[PDB]
Design a protein around this ligand. Structure first.
Ligand code: HEM
Ligand code: HEM
Ligand SMILES: Cc1cc(N)nc(COc2cc(CCN3CCCCC3)cc(F)c2F)c1
Ligand SMILES: Cc1cc(N)nc(COc2cc(CCN3CCCCC3)cc(F)c2F)c1
Ligand SMILES: C[C@H](O)[C@H](O)[C@H]1CNc2nc(N)[nH]c(=O)c2N1
Ligand SMILES: C[C@H](O)[C@H](O)[C@H]1CNc2nc(N)[nH]c(=O)c2N1
Ligand SMILES: [Zn+2]
Lengths: 414, 419
């Protein structure tokens, strides 16, 4: 009936009652914890009888949020949803419900350290969209609004929900802005090695690649289950930041840059049992996402050895900590570069601090805050951020952002 | 059914069947995960005090069965007699006694099963000091000193455990009251601040309240507070020649040595409970050698520990106005370089987090290859700095609770009735 979490740095103890409202699996069992597993069918669309309680729980939740639970408006809405689920095997969210649902899917996203901002989310209703060109128009507008000349604003564009599973809208891109990766005959990789497969798909589909190190990939948009189509985002809408270092003159000669807008486009938004297979959302970067993961993962841009060399570090023994030392300067560079170009960014320290403040506030007013310590802790300097010392309960509330199969793994080509 | 773990850096998938042998709850359910909770579960294997026969024997049968299975017996004459020997023993003493071999097996396998330990690749290479004949705090001291001396081994550290007599009724517990054998005092200053190690302030007070004369410095090795057969604990001063200490200097910053910092060489956990076939060894100090990040990240930089980042940052001439300068991160690296360089130049065994995590991946491979799995706690295995540039960050881990094991136990001062 109650669970406690303790910060071992401050001794503060919070009491989680919200986890009683979770209803879906974590992957853990009573005797094995799967807390570090990253991911614990198209005929799988909810039956009528499956949708009824899921819609009821979400509509109940929504009217409780606006302090209208039990109200005549609550009861009629509840009756109105059941009518559509009966007549049409599905139902349609009102705009208020869509906005509440999208905001609460972010709020419920246990892996996201940025949720102190959840209620500040621009929701673009794109459920009238019917074609890939239309999705392109919507996404360009998303990108322009969110980028806001460097003063980033978080935003989500919601395309039509799933119907039979055979007419899904999908952004085939995993993020809206990503650099291409190209494998060379000699086995080396040009660009972002994470996107080699997606770059091949685009190339095959008709895209003519510049074959450079920072080619923004084209959108690959699927509307209504049709074949996906290519669109080049207009380059004046892709805000980019050249990476220089405040102290090392040579750093700019690495020729590094990154894009300013992090925009996840491969995830599924589930509101009231409705599934929105195409719902790109964006915010602004934490420095480590670029500085530690994008640049320093061995499977990614892999510049640690490049950087440590320019730093004249001893790289024969790990215990010199050359990797660690070089990782810090890259992450300084990334933050300095964004900040100098007045492009919104947040360092892992400010971000984790904000999240602790946000978590404590969510325990006060909501009864808890599901959190994935494996994801919340930044990928460098973990214990010197306050979330490291923070105990966290992980559970799945709905509305939620979910993962879904890659479109090419399931699409049936026309 | 049969669970898979993947390593996202290498795409290696391992298949875990060992988890089927798990005994105790993790704290998790299908609906809530507790993987970041430090003490998620109070599920023990036996009740409060001295157990009935139906409580202790099935645990004993299980461990004996496991140990005789381990050595290609099971059902052999020795195994069946051992079952009867243990049964009669519980019948007549409400407990039983481990053979020396079963004791060594159990201590090694508790370390092998320690889901939070990144250093388990050495698990089978553990020196077990049977001290089950001990009877007094003076005895406990003798044993602990021999442990420290053997384990320290003039810098070439060696893994050891020293196993004092098991719990009987709960009144006559043996306990090392120190959480680790070698820790620095912590002193509550008049002006609100803290000198020394702030984590140890309370234990330091117990020691002073027990008659210890504090030198009142920043690196005052604490005395031992040893409790034998439930009696009042007794202070003992570890002879300093036995406490190997490394002065921290830096290979480039010559000003670093002037920070006046040192650490001890021997990490030696002395407050855990070793659990084997229902038997509880409330005093089982175990030691190995440090991962550098334990001293330089956690012991030195945690806000409620030595907290030397501002000092080292200031000396480095760092923008400390905002977080985005990453001044903490820069100092943190230099500090851990200093720790590693000092231990290596004094030829005191130490491992860096790159080497240690690389080894643990190798250990995982081995364990899945021959044991069908390896329980690991990602939250504890991933080092506290530079997580993602180490192999374990990218390695899915299954956590489950295997016996024999080390367990946490209450701090004896919360429980002990003085006399
Ligand atoms: C506004 C600033 C934001 C910041 C600084 C931020 C920060 C982060 C970071 C660092 C991660 C881990 C990313 C990774 O390691 O791949 C993450 C994950 C995530 N964020 Fe946020 N985020 C922000 C906004 C948002 C928004 C606007 C949404 C949705 C409306 C959102 C939903 C999520 C989700 C669902 C995840 C988990 C992804 C997964 O499960 O794989 N975030 N965030
Ligand atoms: C030989 C070198 C060893 C290394 C490098 C090593 C490394 C580590 C580290 C870094 C931790 C986490 C430390 C912390 O943040 O508190 C840990 C935990 C642990 N280790 Fe090992 N260890 C070693 C030896 C041993 C031995 C010999 C044993 C038992 C005989 C052992 C049993 C454990 C246990 C039970 C934990 C969990 C502690 C807790 O829950 O608080 N380790 N180890
Ligand atoms: C809204 C939002 C804000 C933020 N600050 N961050 C995110 C997550 O953003 C990205 C994450 C990645 C890598 C995704 N990662 C790959 C390995 C497997 C796990 C997922 C690439 C990108 F382009 C991203 F924008 C989302
Ligand atoms: C055998 C062994 C080897 C090794 N390499 N490391 C360890 C861990 O030993 C220590 C651990 C701590 C901190 C314990 N921690 C405090 C915060 C709350 C959680 C528990 C302090 C020390 F002095 C230690 F020696 C043990
Ligand atoms: C909240 C969290 O469980 C706590 O701070 C943990 C995190 N991981 C850890 N990992 C190790 N190795 N040692 C620790 O003390 C901790 N502390
Ligand atoms: C296996 C492990 O869960 C995996 O490497 C996780 C660890 N934590 C992470 N945390 C974040 N923020 N992003 C990630 O991609 C990962 N990867
Ligand atoms: Zn779990």
């Amino acid at each position: 009936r109650f669970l406690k979490v303790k910060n071992w740095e401050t001794e503060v103890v919070l009491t989680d009652t919200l986890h009683l409202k979770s209803t879906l699996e974590t992957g853990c069992t009573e005797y094995i914890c799967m807390g570090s597993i990253m991911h614990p069918r198209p005929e799988d669309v909810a039956t009528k009888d499956q949708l009824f309680p899921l819609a009821k729980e979400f509509i109940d939740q929504y009217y409780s949020s606006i302090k209208r639970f039990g109200s005549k408006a609550h009861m009629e809405r509840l009756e109105e949803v059941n009518k559509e689920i009966d007549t049409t095997s599905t139902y349609q969210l009102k705009d208020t419900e869509l906005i509440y649902g999208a905001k609460h899917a972010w709020r419920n996203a246990s892996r996201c350290v940025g949720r102190i901002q959840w209620s500040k989310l621009q929701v673009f209703d794109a459920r009238d969209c019917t074609t890939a060109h239309g999705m392109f128009n919507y996404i360009c507008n998303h990108v322009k609004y969110a980028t806001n000349k460097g003063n980033l604003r978080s935003a989500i564009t919601i395309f039509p929900q799933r119907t039979d599973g055979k007419h899904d809208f999908r952004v085939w891109n995993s993020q809206l802005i990503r650099y291409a990766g190209y494998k060379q005959p000699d086995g080396s990789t040009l660009g972002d090695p994470a996107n080699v497969q997606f770059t091949e798909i685009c190339i095959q589909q008709g895209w003519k690649p510049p074959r450079g190190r920072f080619d923004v990939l084209p959108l690959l948009l699927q509307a209504n289950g049709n074949d996906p189509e290519l669109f080049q985002i207009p380059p004046e809408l892709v805000l980019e930041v050249p990476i220089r270092h405040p102290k090392f003159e040579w750093f700019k000669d690495l020729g590094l840059k990154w894009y300013g807008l992090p925009a996840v486009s491969n995830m599924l938004l589930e509101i009231g049992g409705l599934e929105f297979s195409a719902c790109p959302f964006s915010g602004w970067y934490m420095g480590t996402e670029i500085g530690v993961r994008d640049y320093c993962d061995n499977s990614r841009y892999n510049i640690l050895e490049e950087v440590a060399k320019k730093m004249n570090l001893d790289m024969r023994k790990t215990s010199s900590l050359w990797k660690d030392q070089a990782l810090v300067e890259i992450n300084i560079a990334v933050l300095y570069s964004f900040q100098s170009d007045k492009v919104t960014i947040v360092d892992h320290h400010s971000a984790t601090e904000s999240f602790i403040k946000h978590m404590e506030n969510e325990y006060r007013c909501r009864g808890g805050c599901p959190a994935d310590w494996v994801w919340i802790v930044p990928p460098m300097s973990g214990s010197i951020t306050p979330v490291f010392h923070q105990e966290m309960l992980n559970y799945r509330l709905t509305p939620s952002f979910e993962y879904q199969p890659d479109p090419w793994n399931t699409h049936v080509w026309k």
